[PDB]
Design an enzyme around this catalytic site. Structure first.
Site, short mmCIF file in Angstrom:
data_model
loop_
_atom_site.label_atom_id
_atom_site.label_comp_id
_atom_site.label_asym_id
_atom_site.label_seq_id
_atom_site.Cartn_x
_atom_site.Cartn_y
_atom_site.Cartn_z
CB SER B 118 54.43 -12.76 25.38
OG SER B 118 54.00 -13.26 24.13
NE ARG B 119 57.48 -5.90 21.17
CZ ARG B 119 58.39 -5.00 20.82
NH1 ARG B 119 59.51 -4.85 21.51
NH2 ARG B 119 58.15 -4.20 19.79
CB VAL B 120 53.21 -12.95 20.05
CG1 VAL B 120 52.01 -13.86 19.79
CG2 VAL B 120 54.21 -13.06 18.92
#
Lengths: 284, 256
Positions: B118-120
């Site tokens: 999850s790059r967020v």
């Protein structure tokens, strides 16, 4: 890379996998035969030990250099190894344990001594530089006691000359069909095995020609017998280790086939797509 | 918003475009296939309150709207390196990779760490969740790699043994039934029990029972803390102490 040579690789690895399955089956069968040869080695040694206990723990308990305990100034190891690879880490684990104890004694100033059964240990301790005074090699899957006489006679000569104060055998133990362990055990001076009975009063041997002469021959035979037992157990351990190693190799080969086939099929589909794009985009 | 199969939409654009004779590219899709999924997904966004105010002519003040997107891609044989999967991986803020080998082994949901990301970042998560989760992800990835080599040879050095036991218990703790959602208080208790060491002395075959009993225990007696943690996801030393007492007392006093 290229699907035709990838398919060639796939065929080659498949052939390899078949042969490793065959080797697993053969290793299991050889383990069986060598563990039958192992049991036949017990009775000789154990009846010899009962006689030796009768004499040594009896009232006629002579003080024999083989039987007595003295301070360690030099120590020796008889070491068993394979003549053949593909056994996994059996040799290396045994040699590591040996290196640990050989370091421990030589830090006490004790000179180490080595006699080698099998060529792998010969090569390993020639690379390490260990002090090897006797060796025998190429016994393969047909060991014989008469071949062991050489190295054990050398080590024994050094022992009763007083040069060596203790002498071990270094070998793996065939505890189970599924599991084995490397060991180091003292064969000289004679260990204080319990070996207690008092029935010797009823049957005391008439020693021809002499009691002590017979005792010396008995001790020499016992050391020879124990070395042969260790050798046969290490051979059975070799067969079991090669069995498990070939099992692992066969499974890994199949698991590599299943990846090469994905690479091959993706290349197949891509080649068809590209060639047909060239043909259709080639027209008109 | 859920898109049930963007791969099937890509097939549809293939059919329309090739019927319009547009020259194909890689895997016979047009190069416009990137733009398709790009402009579709890029609508999903969070907008600032100035945009909401300007859009609604000032009828809504100070609020911020959002559209959350979970696209789904079907991929052949688990190949993450094919064209369309790679295009969509290049557009989203992360991916959740489900492995068929885990699913066939009964580990469900079959999330594969290392590939899933999850790059967020942790900014989405609440405080208690962020503190209790921490490195669990990379610990699981490393446990799986260690299991890979441990299968090959015997080299067990007591910290490897406990790492393996911990990883196996955590994987048995992560699996979950279909249509069985559980709230952040329950999740935080589960994570707390996993990482404060309480699953020591607990059998793998007992792990599911241990959880069922623990969640029933906390639903019965210390419910007000559950209401508090579900209202505000706040991690304090007071709440850690209460959780510590709950797990101490459960482990010592109850059975499963």
């Amino acid at each position: 890379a290229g699907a035709k040579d990838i398919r060639s690789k796939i065929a080659s690895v498949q052939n390899t996998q078949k042969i490793t399955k065959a080797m697993e089956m053969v290793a299991a069968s050889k383990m069986r035969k060598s563990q039958d040869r192992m049991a036949a080695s017990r009775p000789y040694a154990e009846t010899m030990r009962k006689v030796i206990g009768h004499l040594a723990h009896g009232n006629l308990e002579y003080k024999h250099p083989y039987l007595e305990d003295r301070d360690v100034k030099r120590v020796g190891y008889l070491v068993v190894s394979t003549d053949r690879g593909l056994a996994g880490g059996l040799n290396i684990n045994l040699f590591k344990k040996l290196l640990a104890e050989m370091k421990t004694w030589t830090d006490k100033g004790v000179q180490a001594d080595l006699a080698m059964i099998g060529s792998k240990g010969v090569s390993f301790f020639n690379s390490v530089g260990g002090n090897v005074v006797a060796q025998v090699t190429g016994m393969g899957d047909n060991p014989s006691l008469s071949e062991l006489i050489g190295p054990v006679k050398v080590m024994l000569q050094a022992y009763d000359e007083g040069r060596l104060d203790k002498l071990y055998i270094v070998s793996n133990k065939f505890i189970n069909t599924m599991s084995q362990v490397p060991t180091i055990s003292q064969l000289l001076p004679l260990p204080a095995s319990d070996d207690d009975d008092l029935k010797h009063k009823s049957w005391d041997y008439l020693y021809e020609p002499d009691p002590k002469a017979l005792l010396d021959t008995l001790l020499r035979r016992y050391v020879e017998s124990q070395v042969y037992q260790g050798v046969v157990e290490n051979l059975a351990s070799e067969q079991a280790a090669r069995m498990v190693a070939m099992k692992a190799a066969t499974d890994n080969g199949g698991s590599l086939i299943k990846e090469l086939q994905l690479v091959y099929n993706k290349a197949r589909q891509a080649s068809i797509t590209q060639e047909l794009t060239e043909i259709v985009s080639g027209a008109a | 918003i859920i898109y049930d199969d963007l791969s099937k939409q890509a097939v549809a654009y293939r059919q329309i475009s090739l019927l319009l004779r547009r020259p194909p590219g890689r895997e016979a899709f047009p190069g416009d296939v990137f733009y398709l999924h790009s402009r579709l997904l890029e609508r999903a966004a969070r907008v600032n309150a100035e945009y909401v105010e300007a859009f609604t002519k000032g009828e809504v003040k100070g609020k911020t709207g959002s559209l959350t997107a979970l696209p789904i891609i079907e991929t052949q044989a688990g190949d993450v390196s094919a064209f369309v999967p790679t295009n969509v991986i290049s557009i989203t803020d992360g991916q959740i990779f489900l492995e068929t080998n885990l699913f066939n082994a009964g580990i469900r949901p079959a999330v594969n760490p290392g590939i899933s990301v999850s790059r967020v970042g942790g900014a989405a998560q609440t405080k208690i969740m962020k503190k209790l989760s921490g490195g669990i992800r990379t610990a699981l990835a490393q446990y799986r790699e260690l299991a890979a080599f441990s299968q090959a040879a015997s080299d067990l050095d007591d910290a490897t043994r406990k790492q393996l036991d911990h990883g196996q218990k955590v994987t048995e703790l992560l699996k979950q039934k279909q249509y069985a959602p559980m709230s952040v208080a329950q999740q935080s208790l589960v994570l707390f029990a996993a990482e404060r060491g309480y699953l020591a002395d607990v059998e793998l075959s007992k792990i599911g029972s241990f959880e069922a009993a623990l969640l029933a225990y906390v639903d019965r007696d210390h419910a007000p803390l559950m209401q508090e943690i579900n209202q505000t996801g706040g991690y304090n030393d007071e709440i850690e102490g209460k959780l510590k007492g709950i797990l101490d007392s459960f482990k010592a006093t109850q059975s499963w």
